[PDB]
User: Which sequence fits this backbone?
């Protein structure tokens, strides 16, 4: 009664056939049983909003999508519509609720575009990147050169 | 293998492993049913060092310090740093006008909070001998809550519990011990842990942001037992509402709130507020260290590790930036 | 032409006034509670003996049906689930709630989109594995001169 | 690394790797853009041995031979074995009344087939020197098509293209070579079809695989036009798929267009007779796999053993007889 997997809740609402009764070991994670086929067709029904790469990660963390993060939007998006947020690569980020209509998406210079209903993409697929050299490797090169202090640490100046 | 009990007063088992089959991505233990308290600390420390991303950390620091208006608008750091959650505003507004501000803050529980305490919490009596890990749990869970409250500018999201469970070692790692087997030191460890996790797991990884959250925990604790209950009820509701994460209420938060309501001490809470503040003020960037992968051996595959504190990472990044800006490329 | 599934009808996508390839869904998907995406659909619980056929896109027949939800109307888009609560496929209802209760034969649903991997519920052999049995026979010398299992 | 061309007359590239980012689960090559012809054969053979499930194979065999009515009803093997695809019924009905059975079967293409050839196929002329891999591709793809027709009792499903693609080495592995560098190629194509039909589809049964090869023989005997009817059906099944259409682009568009303009009735008849001779020379003892017998106690690595499908059946029949005793 109390414990049931997500898709097995409201178990009473499930009807049996007349005749023999075969009573209802643990399931796996969706990511573990999911096919490697073209499953993105399951989201083709939803209207789309293309998110700027700089805003992708925030959406994976469940954060609201703001005007600076919007790149492209579909016609006919009405307030509160269930939509899909996609990258420029065509990856599905999340299923979201439209927080402004297509007319506002065209005009507004600020505000909430959409709020996340269900995250689809892993966190840190589009992480914050450092344009210059990796810091840990820079410290190793400094140990090799003797450019570090007596305590073996990077000093100020 | 013998089963290893967990949660409130180590009374629970089986619940967590069953949840991992339902998409519990908060749990970070490989084998929750067969990992002893000391092995949870060992696993946590190893996984925290693997999780920490120095490039992400450094990028966040550089955006805050040197980013233009467009960079800062998309990031959101400056807006988060100006935000005061509602619970803190309530305390600060009361404190500003209180004739004697060393006393506890008066609290009148809302109709919703009263219905919560009546309908959602266990009605059993508590006889817990070891109360110290429970007060430390309250501390860690308050930091998780405050950090989430700031990061989301006071509005919960579908991932609010994920954030809360991740910055909390008693949740993600079912670790109430915090320290490896070879009060004040445990408090300091709890604060450092919160900072290390707040710079490794959430969207915004910023030291000033982590310290802001600990300062707000101090204020909540100073407010007293009832203000702490207001926060605990909010935490409890955020987990209760999730079809998967509710297991953390079952194994920890249901009992911790009910035990705190009936057995929580105003004196212990005030002593805790003052001890945590003293420990927080004794800290600097030099206390926040990580082991990072500098390279991989091409022939061997073993990662080559290096130890750095967050300040060394910042200096190295500032040197690279100055070289990029001062010199023509 | 070569565009990704979610990027088709690209012209229909409007801009505001004023090239690395993507990854497989299985490679970028979160390990969180993503089955909530299917909570909207009415359900049909499939007998373990019929799970694999559904993963291969085959029609679901009366012998494979275990439980069905109230209010399933002909042609409704539904979800086929296991007794463990795993999502097998999104399907089209080929009979109503009244027929599911009465019919002793026929097509229950036709697969629209497979979700579960093939062979997660494979055909199992109750007795010992055959390759293991041949090794035991090599060790005992119960095999022919050529090193093969003989008739009798 | 230099790019390795593939598909019809090795004229294509890039398309397959792009498709794998869009959910192309038919492709079985780890690196399609940088795998030479010989390495495709090596990878295929290794992956086929990994894919084959002896317990699944043995279970299917035992259900067919010893299963009760309910076991047989849920499985469907007996119903599949009684099924005749429409294309084959057309041939058999014509053959039964034919005054000169060695002649080719008459075919009037439907309005739908004519529109398909006019609108969906390339209009370019072909000057292909190496035609032998193309006729072998036709042989392999006809097997995939027939097997799918039987398995689904003549109705396509959303996974019809997957079944066909998986049973065809020229599609799944972009392998038109079939044989490693250290008719015989026809025999290899038949054995490959059987091995893949015992490793990939829902129903894994030797008699079912041999029934499909027998039906390929009849289609080939029907002649060029009957083969075109089958090729058009295959082409349409892939064309209609939002992901798998890439196999029409890289192989089936040109294979079909080239066959229509350059296909030889004499070559098709010689192929029908050669494949039948090779098929009839085969037995279960020719169908071998490398299987995991155990796992290394110290390492966990798998210990491999070679078995033909008849040995698997005998061992399973011995276990069953001991159980029933």
Assistant:
């Amino acid at each position: 009664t109390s414990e049931w997997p997500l898709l097995l809740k409201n178990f009473d609402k499930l009807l049996v056939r007349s005749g023999h009764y075969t009573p209802i070991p643990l399931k796996r994670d969706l990511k573990s049983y999911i096919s490697s086929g073209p499953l993105e067709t399951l989201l083709v029904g939803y209207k789309r909003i293309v998110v700027k790469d700089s805003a992708v990660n925030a959406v994976c963390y469940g954060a609201k999508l703001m005007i600076p993060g919007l790149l492209r939007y579909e016609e006919g998006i009405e307030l509160y519509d269930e939509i899909v947020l996609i990258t420029t690569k065509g990856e599905a980020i999340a299923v979201a609720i439209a927080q402004m209509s297509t007319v506002d998406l065209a005009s507004c210079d600020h505000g909430v575009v959409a709020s996340v209903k269900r995250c689809i993409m892993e966190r840190d697929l589009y992480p914050r990147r450092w344009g210059l050299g990796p810091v840990a490797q820079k410290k190793k090169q400094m140990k090799a050169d003797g450019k570090l202090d007596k305590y073996g640490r990077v000093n100020e100046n | 293998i013998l089963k290893t009990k967990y949660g409130f007063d180590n009374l629970y088992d089986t619940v967590i492993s069953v949840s991992t089959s339902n998409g519990n991505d908060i749990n970070e233990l490989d084998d929750p049913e067969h990992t002893d308290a000391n092995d949870r600390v060992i696993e946590r420390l190893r996984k925290e060092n693997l999780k920490f991303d120095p490039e992400y950390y450094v990028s966040e620091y550089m955006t805050h310090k040197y980013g233009n208006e467009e960079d800062l608008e998309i990031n959101g750091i400056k807006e988060l740093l100006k935000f005061t959650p509602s619970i803190v505003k309530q305390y600060l507004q009361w404190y500003k006008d209180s004739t004697n501000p060393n006393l506890v803050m008066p609290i009148e529980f809302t109709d919703e909070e009263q219905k919560q305490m009546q309908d959602n919490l266990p009605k059993k009596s508590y006889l817990v001998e070891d109360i110290k890990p429970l007060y430390v749990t309250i501390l860690s869970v308050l930091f998780s809550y405050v950090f989430e409250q700031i990061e989301n500018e006071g509005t919960h999201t579908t991932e609010s519990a994920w954030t809360m469970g991740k910055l909390c070692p008693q949740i993600s790692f079912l670790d109430q011990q915090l320290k490896q087997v070879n009060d004040s030191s445990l408090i300091k460890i709890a604060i450092i842990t919160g900072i290390r996790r707040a710079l490794s797991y959430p969207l915004h990884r910023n030291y000033d942001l982590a310290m802001k959250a600990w300062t707000f925990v101090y204020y909540i604790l100073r407010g007293g037992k009832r203000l702490v209950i207001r926060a605990l009820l909010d935490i409890h509701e955020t987990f209760r509402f999730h079809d998967v994460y509710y297991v953390y209420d079952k194994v920890l938060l249901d009992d911790l709130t009910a035990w705190f309501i009936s057995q929580g001490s105003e004196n212990v809470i005030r002593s805790l507020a003052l001890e945590m503040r003293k420990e927080q003020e004794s800290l600097s960037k030099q206390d926040i260290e990580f082991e990072c992968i500098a390279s991989f051996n091409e022939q061997t595959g073993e990662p080559e590790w290096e130890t750095l504190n967050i300040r060394e990472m910042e200096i190295l990044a500032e040197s690279e930036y100055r070289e990029q800006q001062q010199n023509p490329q």
